[PDB]
Design a binder for this molecule. Structure first.
Ligand code: GSH
Ligand code: GSH
Lengths: 214, 214
């Protein structure tokens, strides 16, 4: 049975959890303490020593969207990728976008003064971009159903909502400024399997709140 | 006939050129001046407004390794990806690695003091990592033949060799310190189609040299 090494609040782990849950693939979750990384983690992710690590058979697969693509080839049911190659490239483009531009959300969490200033601005340009170019008339990035880009961005934007509250004056992701994006994240959290596997906002705010004060 | 928008010295364009050449796919190269970006570029890459842009039919495909994956699905001859899904994830892992860690090479080019200091150190840890974990006993990342990770890293490391000379005291990518990597880049440049489509080092050194002084 496949193994997922990770830890609860990680956006990168929930990407993998969602893909596993969406495909109703059975797995064992291996709780990892990063201040005390198990020998398993150090053996199977020697390059980055990060989680998630996905252990299928004895082979390890490491970066989270890499794992989602792996999971998707090996377990084709409930496709996270379109069949057309242009649509597939489009889906990958927005995953890549989420990974690169989404780093602003995570710098935000640790930023303070003018540094916090800039990442909030950068976070805002990311959203403006997606809001105008990213999500078409279709309900999800993936069409009528959740795709890899929904996974990738869904973790960026939901964690952003929470990181915002944890920082305080976060006038960043405002629903009336970015209505199409808020409609999309609202629908994404509304999907039964995402709904069932979605960390409760309040708990996370406090968690990242008490984490930021330190 | 497919269109490739780009400009000569760009590592990201040569990724696409190599994939096109390796598959003997015919295309038109559209020279782009980035200080004066054509309306075509602004229309088909509104999100980043960067090159390369690959125009197949009327559809644009934008980030360079995204384009290589597109080219590879649409033109399956001379496969750049393995058939096994684990090997495929492995190949993607090292592409992703090249893209993330390779940014050190490109910060180097613009760095000066302690800033240059750090990126040279970071560049060195990237190489140490690949040198020990990246390339197995097999000749290429892709096995007996060039794969996507060879493409991705091949552009990082060759441009690094050149950027090194352009900066001066670059004691970074030393052949005796990283012999397995030097064997690999040596073999990569030795491949007939890469050899034929490889910017001449001397010209590029000067180009990046005169570019750095400014
Ligand atoms: N898989 C993620 C990276 C995941 C990641 O960065 N995880 C952190 C915590 S969420 C970690 O495991 N270790 C952080 C460290 O030790 O530097 C990706 O797509 O790049
Ligand atoms: N496709 C590349 C990015 C290519 C890129 O950054 N190109 C630069 C020059 S090599 C550009 O077109 N524009 C730079 C700018 O205008 O900011 C990728 O894989 O991210």
């Amino acid at each position: 049975q496949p193994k997922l090494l990770g830890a609860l609040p990680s956006p990168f782990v929930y990407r993998v959890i969602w893909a596993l849950k969406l495909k109703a693939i059975p797995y064992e979750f291996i709780e990892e303490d990063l201040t005390n990384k198990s020998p398993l983690l150090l053996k199977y992710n020697p390059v980055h020593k990060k989680i998630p690590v996905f252990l299928h058979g004895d082979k390890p697969v490491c970066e989270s969207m890499i794992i989602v693509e792996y999971i998707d080839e090996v377990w084709p049911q409930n496709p996270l990728l379109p069949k057309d190659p242009y649509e597939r490239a489009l889906a990958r483009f927005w995953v890549k976008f989420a990974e690169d531009k989404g780093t602003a959300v995570w710098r935000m969490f640790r930023s303070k003064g003018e540094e916090l200033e800039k990442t909030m601005k950068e976070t805002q340009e990311m959203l403006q971009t997606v809001e105008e170019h990213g999500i078409g008339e279709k309900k999800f990035f993936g069409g009528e159903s959740i795709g890899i880009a929904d996974i990738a961005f869904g973790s960026v934007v939901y964690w952003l909502e929470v990181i915002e509250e944890a920082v305080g004056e976060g006038a960043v992701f405002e629903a009336h400024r970015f209505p199409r994006l808020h409609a999309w994240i609202k629908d994404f959290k509304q999907v039964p399997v995402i709904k069932e596997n979605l960390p409760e906002r309040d708990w996370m705010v406090t968690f990242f709140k008490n984490r930021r004060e330190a």
